[PDB]
Amino acid sequence: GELFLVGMGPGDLPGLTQRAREALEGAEVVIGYSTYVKLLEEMGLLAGKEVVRKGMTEELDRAEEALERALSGQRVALVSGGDPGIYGMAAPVLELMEERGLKRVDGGVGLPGRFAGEEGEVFLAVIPGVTAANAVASLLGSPLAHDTCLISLSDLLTPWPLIERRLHAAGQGDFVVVLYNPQSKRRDWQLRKSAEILLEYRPKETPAALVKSAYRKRQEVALTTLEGLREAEAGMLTTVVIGNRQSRFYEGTFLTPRG
Amino acid sequence: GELFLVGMGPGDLPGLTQRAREALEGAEVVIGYSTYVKLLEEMGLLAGKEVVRKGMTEELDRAEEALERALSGQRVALVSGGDPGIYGMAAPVLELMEERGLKRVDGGVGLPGRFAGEEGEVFLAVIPGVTAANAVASLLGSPLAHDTCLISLSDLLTPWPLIERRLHAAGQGDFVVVLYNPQSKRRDWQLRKSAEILLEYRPKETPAALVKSAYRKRQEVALTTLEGLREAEAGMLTTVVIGNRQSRFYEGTFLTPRG
Ligand SMILES: Nc1ncnc2c1ncn2[C@@H]1O[C@H](CSCC[C@H](N)C(=O)O)[C@@H](O)[C@H]1O
Numbered sequence A, B: 001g002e003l004f005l006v007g008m009g010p011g012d013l014p015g016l017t018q019r020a021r022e023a024l025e026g027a028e029v030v031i032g033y034s035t036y037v038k039l040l041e042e043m044g045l046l047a048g049k050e051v052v053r054k055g056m057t058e059e060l061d062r063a064e065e066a067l068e069r070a071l072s073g074q075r076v077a078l079v080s081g082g083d084p085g086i087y088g089m090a091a092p093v094l095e096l097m098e099e100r101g102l103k104r105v106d107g108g109v110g111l112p113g114r115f116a117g118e119e120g121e122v123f124l125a126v127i128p129g130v131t132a133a134n135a136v137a138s139l140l141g142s143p144l145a146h147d148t149c150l151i152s153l154s155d156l157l158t159p160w161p162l163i164e165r166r167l168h169a170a171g172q173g174d175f176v177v178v179l180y181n182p183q184s185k186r187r188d189w190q191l192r193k194s195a196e197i198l199l200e201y202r203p204k205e206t207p208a209a210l211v212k213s214a215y216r217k218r219q220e221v222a223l224t225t226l227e228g229l230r231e232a233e234a235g236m237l238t239t240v241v242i243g244n245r246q247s248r249f250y251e252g253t254f255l256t257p258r259g
């Protein structure tokens, strides 16, 4: 069958690419974490299709469900907010296929591609989407106009010491920093820690911003400084952006020099 | 008037977001580097609109042209391949507005926003788009599934020593690396140099790939290794991706572990 990993962008109907719309239109079943599925349902894009959201809390379960359905011949659309390849479903799906020993049967490289196994075969494709970094950047100004690093503060499957390594490196390289999964009830110290690490490489007054629910209901853009992040409150719907040693504010906009 | 920086994605019609389509539909005049403008013209999206491509070779000229037209009351669409905020027109435009001393007149933060000056006023908005990183990643597998750094190898407005600093940092932090503007007739040594720097942090057999004209005519996906990049030939239509110490190839796909 087919397994299309559909990146839906920041969350609003106009935010999806036509390629994403078409992938959803041609899908028989749609799988994804509850929040994404509901957004699509609200848009009226899931009408007359099988929708799986129950028991789809875990990433591994979503991937296994989508893969097994695809292998059984179904036309599946597995949705990820933003882009599937950025802290999304692309990795879990490929790692699962790898674990099951599915082999490529079309001689191609990269994706899309046809893979097969004793269970059956699957045509896998990834539909790219506007990732959080660019989506929030468009609501800020030109914060990512130069070299940038994308870092997730989720230490669920990644040891914190490795994340600190990533942060120190971003600091020394003078990279604009975009923090994905900046904070949660459990993970309430990671953001502050990240700010303290970067503060060893750039000024306290360095531009920073917290953009919540970009392109969605209750969207919020909060401008602050790197020092301000030490006490800032972020959520799972927030993306944080930290400027480099050249970033500055310009009439309400977050400007990172192109040169 | 209006100045909409429209990110058109990788280059194919289905690759644009609906928001981008709508911004183009509502524009009276469209400005952009020749190649992007031609792609849109081919798509049939510039019919009945004023199209400026002549003399639009330089980024500064494109920005000034778009800004002055907007200030004169025109509804302008300035196009950038991928996303305007990633080595695109967002920075040049804001820096120019800053230089002219345009002031914000709506009390808002970030963008969109209304700015004004003795010359007139302009409503500025950035329409995000799928940037090269995610677009090529979708044609590779899950290469960016973990922390990633975006680096441009264009040393036109950025001293090479700073780029080397960025590269060494990406290496030590064990970041997946995406190289924008990897090579040109003039800049034919930067890619090799970049590979040699990263080779000090990760194995020669580390997965790497060169993706040319993603989603366009003559699209090409070439898989290789970090060592292979030392002699690889890239162009201005190519994006290079270098895996981290955990990246591996899986049945033709470029897989970077999510955890
Ligand atoms: N609309 C939105 N506004 C702000 N941040 C968002 C967002 N959508 C996703 N994110 C960011 O991404 C995190 C989830 S991780 C999944 C990210 C997704 N694949 C992408 O490409 O964006 C969130 O915790 C947040 O930091």
Ligand SMILES: Nc1ncnc2c1ncn2[C@@H]1O[C@H](CSCC[C@H](N)C(=O)O)[C@@H](O)[C@H]1O
Binding pocket: B010, B011, B080, B081, B082, B083, B084, B085, B086, B087, B088, B130, B131, B132, B133, B136, B179, B180, B181, B182, B211, B212, B213, B214, B215, B216, B235, B236, B237, B238, B239, B240
């Ligand atoms: N269709 C495509 N395929 C491969 N690389 C592309 C591409 N479009 C843009 N790029 C990459 O981007 C460079 C131009 S820099 C402008 C990038 C653009 N704003 C974006 O967001 O992608 C190219 O030299 C190349 O490295």
